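Could someone model zinc ion with this protein?
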Amino acid sequence: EEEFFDAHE
Amino acid sequence: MAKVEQVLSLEPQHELKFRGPFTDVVTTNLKLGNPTDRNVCFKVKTTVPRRYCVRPNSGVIDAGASLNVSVMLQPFDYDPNEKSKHKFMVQSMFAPPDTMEAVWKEAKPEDLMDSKLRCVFEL
Ligand SMILES: [Zn+2]
Ligand SMILES: [Zn+2]
Ligand SMILES: [Zn+2]
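Reply:
Sure, complex below.
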C-alpha cells in the first residue's frame, strides 16, 4: 500500500 | 512468520510533529534507546524520502545506550488543508557477534523489528 523507502541523508 | 516486538525504545513513540514556519529547515528529534545487553542495528525508512534528511539514517546503537536521530523537514510549500500522508519507520535487528550492509542484505523479514510513526504538520 504505502511503501517505505530507506531514508536519505 | 510473525514479527517480534520492537526491542528499541522510541521517543516520540507514535508521532513526529513539525511546527512551521517551513521557510527554514524544521528539525524534530527521534531518540532511540537500547536497554539491552547487545548492540542493535537500526535503519530509518519513510514514505517520503525526498522530503526529509535523516541524520543518521542508519547505524548501530551500543548496549545500554541512546541515539538522537535528527529528522529534518526540508523547506516546502505548506498547504494547511492537505493532510500529511508522511510516515516513518524504525527497523531494527540484533548485531551479529564480531560485526553492516552485508548483515541487512541477508536479513529475512521476521528478523526485522518495525515501529511506525506518523508525521504531523502544524502552523
Ligand atoms: Zn531512495
Ligand atoms: Zn539535509
Ligand atoms: Zn541531507
